[PDB]
Amino acid sequence: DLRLHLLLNTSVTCNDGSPAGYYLKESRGSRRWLLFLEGGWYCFNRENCDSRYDTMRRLMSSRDWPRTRTGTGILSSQPEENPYWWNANMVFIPYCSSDVWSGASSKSEKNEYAFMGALIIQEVVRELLGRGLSGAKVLLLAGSSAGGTGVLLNVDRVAEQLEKLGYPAIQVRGLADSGWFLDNKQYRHCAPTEAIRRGIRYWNGVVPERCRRQFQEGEEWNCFFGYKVYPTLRSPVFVVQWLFDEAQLTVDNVHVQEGLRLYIQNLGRELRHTLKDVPASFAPACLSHEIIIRSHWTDVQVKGTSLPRALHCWDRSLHPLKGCPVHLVDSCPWPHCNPSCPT
Ligand SMILES: COC(=O)c1cc2c(s1)-c1ccccc1OC2
Ligand SMILES: *[C@@H]1O[C@H](CO)[C@@H](O)[C@H](O)[C@H]1NC(C)=O
What we know:
Elements: E1 2-6, E2 21-25, E3 32-37, H1 46-55, E4 68-69, E5 89-93, H2 117-129, E6 138-144, H3 146-165, E7 171-177, H4 192-203, H5 209-215, H6 226-229, E8 237-240, E9 244-245, H7 246-251, H8 258-275, E10 281-283, E11 287-288, E12 301-302, E13 305-306, H9 307-317, E14 327-329
Parallel strand pairs: 3-5, 3-6, 6-7, 7-8, 8-10, 9-11, 10-14
Antiparallel strand pairs: 1-2, 1-4, 2-5, 12-13
Helix pairs in contact: 2-3
The structure holds ligand U65 and 2-acetamido-2-deoxy-beta-D-glucopyranose (NAG).
PDB class: hydrolase
Keywords: Notum Fragment Screen, hydrolase
Assembly: monomeric
């Protein structure tokens, strides 16, 4: 079990001003730290944030969080469930900022909600350094869905933060699961480009600096899209992405005749194309959503290699490897053409 710690700096808050926090299970003797960013969509205006506060309040507030959580999948400490990093120090950072982990705005007389996702990550890292993170060799910032996009937005900032704080020996790496979206046309006619454009202003959202310098003012929304922000990043990032991610299909208004068949096949081909030059990636041809904290995350394989194996091969690559691949993208063109897809 991972134990809840609310942030000691209580000015770093969830949406409603309650303290943000993290769940931690230490593994003394291990110098590996896994910091996982939870996902769960976002909200981009007062009206839809108010609705989320009414019926998805755990994603906006710490008031009702449990004292403990069980680590599952990549957060499991049992080697049978987690062949990759079962002995690591485990951190689960709840998503309570509704801002794709991009915000740096406090609740004030002008703001009903605080959007502090980027500051939550920074403050968790700061407080962990006094709890053993100062001794780390590798900090893997991982996350699923909105948390996977959060990895892409924040991994280089964590790296810069540790450098400026005087810890140049901690290797910061990213694992982005189900957070690699396409700004494509919907199958039938608020879409991700517009949602994030509004969100950035509403959240005071921040993006990685090199990507910001490319797209410039008013165009920072581009940096929320994996294929645009990834080439600007310096930290090693492993990308896990279903080719037919259910959240991608939802925003595309897809829920089979020729037009839809062509749409779905083109979507998979486009996603495959965006991963061609991503050397550490795992992209199975499945219709599904998230993977890495599911207990059966071990079961899916691409080209005969599981994700825990691919991640282990990635670790070795950061010390091509014989029989230990790190770039695993399905080429078959329809959901479940990979027999190991989740049922
Ligand atoms: C559970 O579903 C989610 O959490 C997310 C869905 C989307 C997200 S996150 C998103 C993030 C960056 C750029 C575009 C995006 O389109 C849809
Ligand atoms: C608390 O967090 C805020 C916002 O991130 C920051 O400005 C402030 O310096 C922090 N205070 C302490 C004591 O860490």
